[PDB]
Amino acid sequence: MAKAAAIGIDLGTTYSCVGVFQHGKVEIIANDQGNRTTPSYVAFTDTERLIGDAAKNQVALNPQNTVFDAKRLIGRKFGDPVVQSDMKHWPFQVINDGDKPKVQVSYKGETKAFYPEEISSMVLTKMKEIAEAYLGYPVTNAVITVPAYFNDSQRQATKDAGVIAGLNVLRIINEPTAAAIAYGLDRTGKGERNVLIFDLGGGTFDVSILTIDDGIFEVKATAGDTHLGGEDFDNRLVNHFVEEFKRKHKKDISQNKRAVRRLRTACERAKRTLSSSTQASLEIDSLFEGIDFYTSITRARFEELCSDLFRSTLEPVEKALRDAKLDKAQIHDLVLVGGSTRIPKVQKLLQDFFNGRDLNKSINPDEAVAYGAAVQAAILIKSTR
Numbered sequence: 001m002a003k004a005a006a007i008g009i010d011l012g013t014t015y016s017c018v019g020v021f022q023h024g025k026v027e028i029i030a031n032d033q034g035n036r037t038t039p040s041y042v043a044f045t046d047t048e049r050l051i052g053d054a055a056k057n058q059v060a061l062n063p064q065n066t067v068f069d070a071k072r073l074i075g076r077k078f079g080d081p082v083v084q085s086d087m088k089h090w091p092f093q094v095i096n097d098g099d100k101p102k103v104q105v106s107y108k109g110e111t112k113a114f115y116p117e118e119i120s121s122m123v124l125t126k127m128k129e130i131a132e133a134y135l136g137y138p139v140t141n142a143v144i145t146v147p148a149y150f151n152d153s154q155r156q157a158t159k160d161a162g163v164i165a166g167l168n169v170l171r172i173i174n175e176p177t178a179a180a181i182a183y184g185l186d187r188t189g190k191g192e193r194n195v196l197i198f199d200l201g202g203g204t205f206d207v208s209i210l211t212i213d214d215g216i217f218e219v220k221a222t223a224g225d226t227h228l229g230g231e232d233f234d235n236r237l238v239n240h241f242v243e244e245f246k247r248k249h250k251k252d253i254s255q256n257k258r259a260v261r262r263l264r265t266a267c268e269r270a271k272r273t274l275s276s277s278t279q280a281s282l283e284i285d286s287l288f289e290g291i292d293f294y295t296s297i298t299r300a301r302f303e304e305l306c307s308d309l310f311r312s313t314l315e316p317v318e319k320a321l322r323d324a325k326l327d328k329a330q331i332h333d334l335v336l337v338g339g340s341t342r343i344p345k346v347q348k349l350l351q352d353f354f355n356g357r358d359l360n361k362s363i364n365p366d367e368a369v370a371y372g373a374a375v376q377a378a379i380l381i382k383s384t385r
């Protein structure tokens with residue numbers, strides 16, 4: 001029953017996703033708000049602890065006690081230059097506990113501090129409860145994914161987050177490996193298969209090159225930008241609309257924190273619409289000083305606003321090919337991962353770079369990793385019996 005069941009979890013930097021392989025198909029499980037992905041956010045309030053959508057929805061009102069980006073800290077030492085650099089951009093406090101970072105917050109009126117693995121375990125607990133609500137019984141066996149460049153310390157702290165959350169961790173697998181499994185790229189028979197995974201998420205960009213030789217996976221190269229993602233494109237839209245509001249009304253809104261946040265969430269929504277329509281409309285009642293902001297933007301203007309950012313995704317692709325010592329024609333498969341790969345201009349740029357090649361994109365890109373993890377979790381639990 002439950003002992004023969006296993007889930008696949010994509011524990012992402014900004015969003016997490018959970019899947020289950022049953023009756024010959026993967027089911028990506030919707031949360032209690034009907035969303036197939038859940039924000040990797042944990043909020044600490046005066047009465048409760050919030051995880052996911054409810055935590056992301058109150059981030060504006062409670063920025064000091066709303067934790068996110070725990071995956072940027074997991075398995076790292078406080079002194080690490082990555083930690084020191086990132087800390088300058090977070091509104092929550094990061095403290096040092098014997099060269100280990102802890103996030104310090106106010107919870108139910110008391111000062112509390114948590115290890116990144118304790119924060120990630122609260123995200124994992126929510127994903128576990130989402131699966132349990134869908135299945136009707138508690139499931140404890142899980143496959144959890146990590147980026148291909150995670151070292152032993154980051155993988156061990158991710159497994160520890162799984163243990164704290166009450167999960168039996170069957171395996172820690174690489175995110176590009178889970179994506180290649182989702183597309184059945186390890187079941188093409190004999191001979192080495194070279195796969196490039198193009199993963200553009202909410203806050204990170206990763207390029208991975210894998211060789212699959214008779215079911216065996218090998219990471220040939222990893223490249224990317226840890227600080228490039230969908231949120232930079234939302235910010236380019238924000239800057240445009242701040243300048244358009246100034247041209248129409250002769251008023252600078254940039255300093256009004258509420259106006260900028262409402263504009264940011266509307267821009268994110270308009271950006272998503274621009275992936276399937278050639279225009280999107282913004283409808284913000286009383287944006288600033290009682291002034292409604294009802295406007296629109298074409299996909300052409302959006303592509304101009306992010307042009308330099310979209311083009312920058314091709315340098316890590318070339319860098320990964322040179323590190324792997326492979327030419328473009330030596331890559332058998334191109335796989336899209338991350339919600340931002342839905343942007344038509346991004347697909348066009350990657351397709352033209354690979355001389356007009358077809359892209360593997362039929363699986364929801366923000367769901368492909370959980371999909372593959374769910375497939376692996378089913379194979380692993382079946383072999384365990």
Ligand SMILES: Nc1ncnc2c1nc(Cl)n2[C@@H]1O[C@H](CO)[C@@H](O)[C@H]1O
Pocket residue numbers: 015200201202203229230231268271272273275338339340341342343366
């Ligand atoms: N339809 C879309 N068109 C463009 N961007 C999208 C889309 N869906 C998501 Cl999710 N994202 C973005 O992907 C990230 C999460 O993986 C977020 O930045 C989200 O806005």
